[PDB]
Design a protein around this ligand. Structure first.
Ligand SMILES: NC(=O)c1ccc[n+]([C@@H]2O[C@H](COP(=O)([O-])OP(=O)(O)OC[C@H]3O[C@@H](n4cnc5c(N)ncnc54)[C@H](OP(=O)(O)O)[C@@H]3O)[C@@H](O)[C@H]2O)c1
Ligand SMILES: CCc1nc(N)nc(N)c1OCCCOc1ccccc1CCC(=O)NS(=O)(=O)N(C)C
Length: 173
């Protein structure tokens, strides 16, 4: 239960990580949008994901502005159960199993997909945003991590955007 894992990824393996930003309450989205824009979090998301495959749910793809998607520098994969859903510039697949063919994959949202992917994941990179944002019916929420996960929490930091935030890194075998 406490064996070490390495950060080096052999090319024959399939490392699955989750990356998300949440308010303390666990909200990650409402009404199809992320309710903040922190430049430190945006930079961090790129630094982690650049050069890898990114997997997202169909609703997260829908929420990206048409002009910015697919996100550059990364293989974009969108999960949909709809046989007629298409994503220009990206691959649409019908299962998580089909999406996880690369050696390093970052699941980048949203609520449903994080839940679905967790069982396969060995890394989570979390940004906590210190914004008063209550959970409302219909909100997209973050996954909750059990005791199989070990992690490190950074100190509270202060965004140029005027909100406090802090970074968590979690891993498991
Ligand atoms: N704060 C953050 O870090 C962050 C990051 C990303 C997104 N978000 C937020 O999350 C919100 C969306 O979350 P969400 O839960 O509503 O939707 P989502 O997870 O982004 O996408 C859900 C869609 O994924 C497809 N899907 C789900 N399970 C599948 C499966 N087993 N196999 C194949 N396809 C599957 C389905 O598409 P079909 O209906 O087409 O079949 C489903 O409707 C966004 O609006 C955004 O606000 C937040
Ligand atoms: C930057 C937002 C973010 N942060 C973390 N730590 N993890 C994530 N997975 C994450 O989501 C990025 C992908 C989803 O992005 C959106 C989803 C729904 C609505 C809007 C967005 C874009 C928000 C944004 O800040 N975009 S951006 O400028 O950073 N960039 C285009 C990706």
């Amino acid at each position: 239960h406490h064996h070490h894992s390495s950060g080096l990824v052999p090319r024959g393996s399939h490392m699955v990580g989750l990356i998300w930003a949440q308010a303390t309450s666990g909200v990650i989205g409402r009404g199809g949008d992320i309710p903040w824009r922190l430049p430190e979090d945006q930079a961090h998301f790129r630094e982690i994901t650049m050069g890898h495959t990114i997997v997202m749910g169909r609703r997260t793809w829908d929420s990206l502005p048409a002009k910015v998607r697919p996100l550059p520098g990364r293989r974009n994969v969108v999960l949909s159960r709809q046989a007629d859903f298409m994503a220009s510039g990206a691959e649409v697949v019908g299962s998580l199993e089909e999406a996880l063919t690369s050696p390093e994959t970052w699941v980048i949202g949203g609520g449903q997909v994080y839940a679905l992917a967790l069982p396969y994941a060995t890394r989570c990179e979390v940004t906590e945003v210190d914004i008063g944002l209550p959970r409302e019916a219909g909100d997209a929420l973050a996954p909750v991590l059990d005791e199989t996960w070990r992690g490190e929490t950074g100190e509270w930091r202060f965004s140029r955007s005027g909100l406090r935030y802090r970074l968590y890194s979690y891993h498991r075998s």
